[PDB]
RNA sequence: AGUUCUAUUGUGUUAGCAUGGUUUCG
RNA sequence: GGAAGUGUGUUUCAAAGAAAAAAAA
RNA sequence: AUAAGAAUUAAAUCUUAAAAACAAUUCGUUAAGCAAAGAAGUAGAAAAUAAGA
RNA sequence: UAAUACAGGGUUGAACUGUGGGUUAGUUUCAAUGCCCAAGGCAGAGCACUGGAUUGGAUACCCAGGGAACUGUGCUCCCAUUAAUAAGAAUCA
RNA sequence: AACUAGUCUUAAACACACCGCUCGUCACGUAACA
RNA sequence: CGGUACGAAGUCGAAACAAGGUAGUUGAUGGUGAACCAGUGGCUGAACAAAAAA
């Protein structure tokens, strides 16, 4: 959470994590949602 | 799955010959014949039909007259009581609070059924035998695969054909895209749900 | 409602100041300047407890301060603890 | 399920309108099982304001009527649609009758304590 | 009463001050910590007079 | 600087005092039996005063603003202009033969100085009545205008 | 606005207009 | 703690209604 | 329906109004 | 063009205009979509969250 | 957040019951706005954009207008994600 | 109703103390990853 | 390729810290030489102003 919550707020994870909540600029999940 | 919901739902709503509460030849004969059909079943509120059928399961479950807290007649209940709020939710399918304590009474019947086993087998499978549910047996522990666990969902599955089982739906398993009559391609998110063998 | 003001023997002053003072009281010109302007959920949350956590401090103050004039204007002097077991025998 | 209505007629309704009116909520009582149990009129009254009924005009007073009856519950959103429908009936509501303030049993003495 | 549609969380000293009726400091719990009293050492602060110390005996 | 409506000026036809104003089947503007309210309207701009005889069915009389005293712009927004359109109404008001009235408003602001000028010009007031009309439903059931500066 | 304004001012007129037509 | 009943419901979904800002019509 | 009155259950006006300011009489 | 309405720190865009049906103000009537203003003390059980500066 | 219909939870009592629980993944019901999709579509207000001003200058703050978004058992859980600083037992009258 | 000197309160990422601190594009060389 | 870290301080503005001179920041967006701006919903890690009682 210390350097994977740093990384979320610098903006990684936005650019290169698909995401089921989409977005016009986020990679979107072509498959059914589920929790992880 | 269309077709078994009405089922359940014209079975939920069908109104036997019986009063409301308690009742009784005596009590009903001081009144006139107007007012006694107002007591009747036919004009109870649907929490009062379903007190009547709860009190009718403990009838046949209880220890003895007033036994409502014996693990068995508080199967019987709960039993009800879940049959009640499925039904409630498929009519107001918006309602998600309820939703929320079907899950909370399905975990509580579970732990019921879990502990009457080892308390009585004999009347825990006559219990199960009367109320036409599953009869799960606890004698080693569950499985941590999902193939394998119980399914307090699937119990009292005779009545719900719809809920029994459910293909694999993720990564690998997700349905395959279809192009409509439209001409547009969608894919499902779950497996259109089979009739069960 | 509107307030109705009927200027019988009386200033016309003095009924538009009961009037002010009636609108005051019921809040009307705070619920006007509220409608003519959009406020945000979050923002009327923040006011609302910002309110609720003054107002009776501001209460308390007046009591406070009404106290204090009383006691200014009848010349009253600060008070000591009554000492039990005082007899509160008249002497007479 | 016991429930009582309160109707408020305009003064354009006359006692063959009430008299129809009663008979149709009769009917849906026992369509849905149920009976009638009491019918009372409660004198003309004024309304604290001027009602404008759209279509129907402006009216400053009206006859109450009540109507205690019995009846499953799902007689109750037909009932109100009927009432609603109807046009010389101004104001309309039901409710269901409780064990002590109701009008078939606390009726009398309800300002005068003595 | 009014209707806010929920209340707010507050972390800071400052914001809660201003939020909350009142922040006087309470008496401590006697299961947690123990009562203060006068024979409490003072806090070791240089006395200080408008940002200059007062520090002479005479 | 003529001190009026410079349009209405222009175009007055002869100049006979309340010539446009429809009158009775008698022939007469006022009953010597009719009542009369002054209902104000006050904003940030501008004020506008409406004199109505309440027996004609609450009809408009006559009625004053910023523009009919003659007052343009900024100036409109002080409170000389709220006065003056109260002198205005005052004067009017003894002219036709009008004394007494009723005052009704909904905003407070900017109606001292009509209540004001009324008094010190004669104008009696019988009473005060402030309807504000608020909302009973809500407070964005219309989502209002958007709060200035962001 | 000045849409919904113009659109009705319009309406109105037409409307006036085919109705002292009728 | 749990089950049943009991008195109460500013909880969640609900057909319709009373009122009201705003716009609208004359 | 608006505004009023009291020998009344009475009268009056009436289905939108409003087109300088300041005065005289 | 122009005034008035509107608005603004002040202006302008904008609407009406030449006797007015909808620029703006007053009065009636419906019509449309929309819907926490008013009614609950985060206070009072002893009930207490973080050594120090 | 009036009444009505259908369901909870909480509180109080009687009865029943008799260690029947605390925590919880190879679990899944729900969940602001935005975006995708579908609906409707001009009550209000309102991105982009247009033009009226201020500014050396503004692609803004101010004004007028505005076809994006504002009501869904769908797709769906990113977050300063919802009553707080995880849940339970013990210590207090 | 305004200004200076105080004096008091509040806020602060200022403490060389607002003539403070401080953000970014562009330009400019040495490099790693890709 | 786009981005990134170090040295240098050059041009352009002044986005944040005070109500920082339009509160800040956040989710997903639209727009823009740059910091950024606008709407919407969140938070406070924000201010200003702020009731006697009829």
């Known amino acids: ?36 | 799955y269309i077709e078994a919901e009405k089922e359940f739902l014209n079975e939920r709503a069908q109104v036997p010959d019986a009063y409301i509460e308690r009742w009784h030849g005596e009590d009903l004969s001081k009144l006139s014949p107007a007012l006694r059909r107002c007591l009747h079943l036919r004009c109870a509120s649907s929490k009062e039909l379903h007190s009547w059928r709860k009190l009718q399961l403990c009838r046949l479950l209880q220890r003895r007259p007033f036994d409502t807290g014996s693990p068995a007649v508080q199967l019987a209940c709960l039993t009800e009581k879940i049959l009640n709020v499925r039904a409630h939710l498929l009519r107001h399918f918006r309602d998600q609070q309820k939703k929320k304590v079907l899950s909370i009474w399905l975990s509580r019947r579970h732990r019921v059924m879990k502990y009457l086993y080892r308390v009585d087998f004999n009347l825990y499978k006559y219990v199960c035998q009367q109320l036409r549910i599953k009869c799960v047996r606890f004698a080693i522990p569950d499985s941590r695969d999902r193939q394998r666990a119980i399914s307090p969902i699937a119990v009292d599955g005779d009545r719900c054909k719809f809920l029994i089982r459910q293909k694999l739906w993720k990564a690998r398993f997700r349905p395959r895209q279809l192009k409509q009559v439209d001409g547009k391609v969608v894919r499902f998110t779950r497996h259109p749900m089979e009739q069960p063998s | 409602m509107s307030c109705h003001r009927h200027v019988f023997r009386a200033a016309p002053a003095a009924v538009f100041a009961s009037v002010q003072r009636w609108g005051r009281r019921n809040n009307v010109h705070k619920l006007t300047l509220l409608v003519q302007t959009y406020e945000k959920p979050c923002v009327k949350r923040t006011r609302i407890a910002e309110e609720k956590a003054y107002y009776p401090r501001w209460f308390y103050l007046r009591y406070a301060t009404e106290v204090i004039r009383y006691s200014l204007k009848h010349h009253l002097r600060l008070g000591q603890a009554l000492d039990p077991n005082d007899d509160q025998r008249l002497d007479a | ?114 | ?58 | ?150 | ?22």
């Open chain 7, 1 to 22: 606005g000045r849409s919904k304004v113009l659109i009705r001012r319009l309406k109105e007129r037409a409307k006036k207009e085919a109705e002292k037509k009728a």
């Open chain 6, 1 to 150: 600087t003529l001190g009026g409506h410079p349009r209405r000026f222009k175009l007055m036809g002869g100049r006979p005092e309340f010539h446009h104003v429809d009158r009775n089947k008698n022939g007469h503007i006022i009953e010597p039996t009719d009542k009369f309210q002054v209902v104000i309207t006050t904003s940030k701009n501008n004020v506008h005063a409406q004199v109505v005889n309440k027996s004609r069915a609450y009809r408009t009389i006559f009625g004053s603003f910023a523009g009919n005293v003659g007052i343009r712009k900024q100036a409109q927004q002080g409170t000389q202009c709220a006065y003056r359109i109260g002198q205005n109404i005052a004067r009017k008001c003894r002219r036709l033969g009008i004394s007494q009235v009723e005052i009704k408003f909904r905003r407070i602001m900017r109606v001292n100085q009509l209540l004001q000028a009324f008094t010190a010009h004669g104008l009696g007031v019988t009473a005060i009545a402030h309807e504000p009309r608020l909302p009973k439903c809500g407070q964005n059931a219309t989502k209002p205008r958007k709060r200035r500066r962001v």
């Open chain 1, 1 to 36: 959470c210390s350097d994977r919550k740093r990384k979320i707020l610098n903006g990684t994870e936005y650019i290169r994590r698909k995401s089921s909540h989409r977005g016009r600029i986020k990679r979107g999940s072509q498959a059914p949602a589920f929790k992880r």
């Open chain 5, 1 to 58: 009463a009014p209707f806010p549609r929920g209340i707010v969380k507050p972390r800071s000293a400052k914001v809660r001050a201003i939020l909350n009726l009142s922040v006087e400091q309470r008496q401590p719990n006697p299961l947690r910590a123990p009562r203060k009293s006068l024979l409490d050492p003072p806090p070791c602060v240089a006395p200080l007079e408008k940002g200059n110390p007062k520090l002479d005996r005479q």
């Open chain 4, 1 to 114: 399920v016991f429930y009582e209505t309160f109707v408020l007629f305009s003064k354009r309704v006359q006692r063959a309108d009430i008299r129809q009116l009663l008979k149709q909520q009769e009917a849906l009582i026992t369509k849905h099982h149920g009976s009638m149990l009491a019918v009372r009129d409660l004198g003309w009254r004024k309304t604290a304001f001027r009602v404008i009924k759209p279509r129907q005009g402006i009216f400053w007073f009206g006859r109450l009527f009540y109507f205690s009856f019995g009846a499953n519950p799902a007689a109750i959103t037909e009932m109100s649609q009927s009432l609603q429908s109807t046009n010389g009936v101004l104001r309309h509501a039901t409710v269901r009758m409780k064990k002590r303030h109701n009008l078939m049993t606390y009726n009398h003495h309800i300002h005068a304590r003595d």
